[PDB]
Scaffold this motif. Structure first.
Motif: not given
Lengths: 53, 53
Positions: A20-23, A25, A28-35, A37-38, B1, B4, B15-16, B18, B20-21
């Protein structure tokens, strides 16, 4: 013969699906980029090579 | 099913992130320079090489 015909008529052409539909979900890829104030934007850090005129 | 499919429809393409600011707000440097009554301006001490005519 009657039982076989009844079974054939009841089952018809029922296709058997192994999966059936794969579990999983998250596609995408986890966004490890920082954020910081600059940053100039939540999606970009600098505008490095941009030249104004 | 059904469970799922419900989970997939509810999560969508979330999107996840990791991070924040960042909590470090101060992006400048501390101004350790002194200010004295002899200064010509709050931002400058003397006008050393300036030549009037």
């Amino acid at each position: 013969e009657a039982h076989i015909q009844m079974k054939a008529a009841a089952l018809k052409s029922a296709q058997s699906r192994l999966f059936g539909l794969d579990g999983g979900i998250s596609t995408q890829e986890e966004n490890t980029e920082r954020h910081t104030t600059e940053d100039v934007s939540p999606s970009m850090h600098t505008l490095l090579g941009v030249k104004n005129m």
